[PDB]
């Protein structure tokens, strides 16, 4: 399937409490592999996945130097936006950026993106074409004009189409045993009694990778999608994921309901009943 390289950046001002909190987190697919945090004892870019041990000390030095530069850039950005939006220095504010590229199974580029947000709202975003920007409001329009007349989209397009894809491939090669693996879900159903003759059936799916999975309850063929209570797939702290889906049913008639689990580690979808 298609793979992705994502960098999540967040800058948070904290007036009185010093200079802003700055963090960068990188993901190859759903797996975290690099991190930077300004609050660390001594802030460095560092690995979060074992396979990144294959990069030498020159890699980590350059990433750290990049991050140090980016921190200063987002400090300025934070101060700039105070002027633009006419806000006081006493309040805390957040800038978030998501940047990445996605490649197909053959390693060729599918799409690239970068989006900025201020205090949780869309600020400025690169378009599908990778040539132009789109601004959410008038503060972002000022930024839009700065970036057009400096040719920022040209430098970013080069990074996304060239540099981003080339390193993603290397990460997929170096981390193949981790990134290209497939852990199958182990599933089971739990029974939970309730008032007024009802029963909650919960279908669990544990220890699977990658994260993409479908849980569904059925009754005589039809999928109970709207009547399902659900949680978003969630990491289990070891590079695997888990999920559960539940539905309320009448007492005694539990066997007529069935849970179906669709995952790429399951050549045939699981079907559990109780």
């Amino acid at each position: 399937g298609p793979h992705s390289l994502r960098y999540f950046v967040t800058a948070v001002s904290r007036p009185g409490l010093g200079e802003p909190r700055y963090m960068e987190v990188g993901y190859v697919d759903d797996t975290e592999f690099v991190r930077f945090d300004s609050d660390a004892e001594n802030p460095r870019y560092e690995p979060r996945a074992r396979w990144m041990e294959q990069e030498g000390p020159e890699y980590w030095e350059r990433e750290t130097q990049k991050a140090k530069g980016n921190e200063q850039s987002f400090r300025v950005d934070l101060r700039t936006l105070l002027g633009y939006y006419n806000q006081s220095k006493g309040g805390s504010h957040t800038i978030q950026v998501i940047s990445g590229c996605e490649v197909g199974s053959d390693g060729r580029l599918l799409r690239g993106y970068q989006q900025y947000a201020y205090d949780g709202c869309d600020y400025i975003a690169l378009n599908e074409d990778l040539k132009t920007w789109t601004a959410a409001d008038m503060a972002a329009l000022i930024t839009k004009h700065k970036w057009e007349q400096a040719g920022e989209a040209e430098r970013l397009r080069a990074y996304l189409e060239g540099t981003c894809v080339e390193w993603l491939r290397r990460y997929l090669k170096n981390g193949n045993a981790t990134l290209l693996r497939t852990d199958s879900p182990k599933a089971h159903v739990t029974h939970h009694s309730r008032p007024e003759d009802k029963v909650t059936l919960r279908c669990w799916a544990l220890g699977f990778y990658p994260a993409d999975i479908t849980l569904t309850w059925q009754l005589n063929g039809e999928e109970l999608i709207q009547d399902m209570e659900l949680v978003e797939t969630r990491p289990a702290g070891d590079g695997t994921f888990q999920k559960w889906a539940s539905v309320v049913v009448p007492l005694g008639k539990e066997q007529y309901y069935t849970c179906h689990v669709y995952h790429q580690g399951l050549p045939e979808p699981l079907t559990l009943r109780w």
């Binding site: 960098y7 950046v9 960068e24 990188g26 690099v34 870019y45 990433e63 990049k66 991050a67 530069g69 980016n70 850039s73 987002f74 300025v76 950005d77 700039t80 936006l81 633009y84 950026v97 940047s99 970068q114 503060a139 000022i142 930024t143 700065k146 970036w147 400096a150 920022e152 430098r155 970013l156 990074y159 540099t163 981003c164 080339e166 390193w167």
Partner: peptide, 9 residues
């Protein structure tokens, strides 16, 4: 390889 230049707003 993280982005090395976020241009200022």
């Amino acid at each position: 390889f993280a982005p090395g230049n976020y241009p200022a707003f």
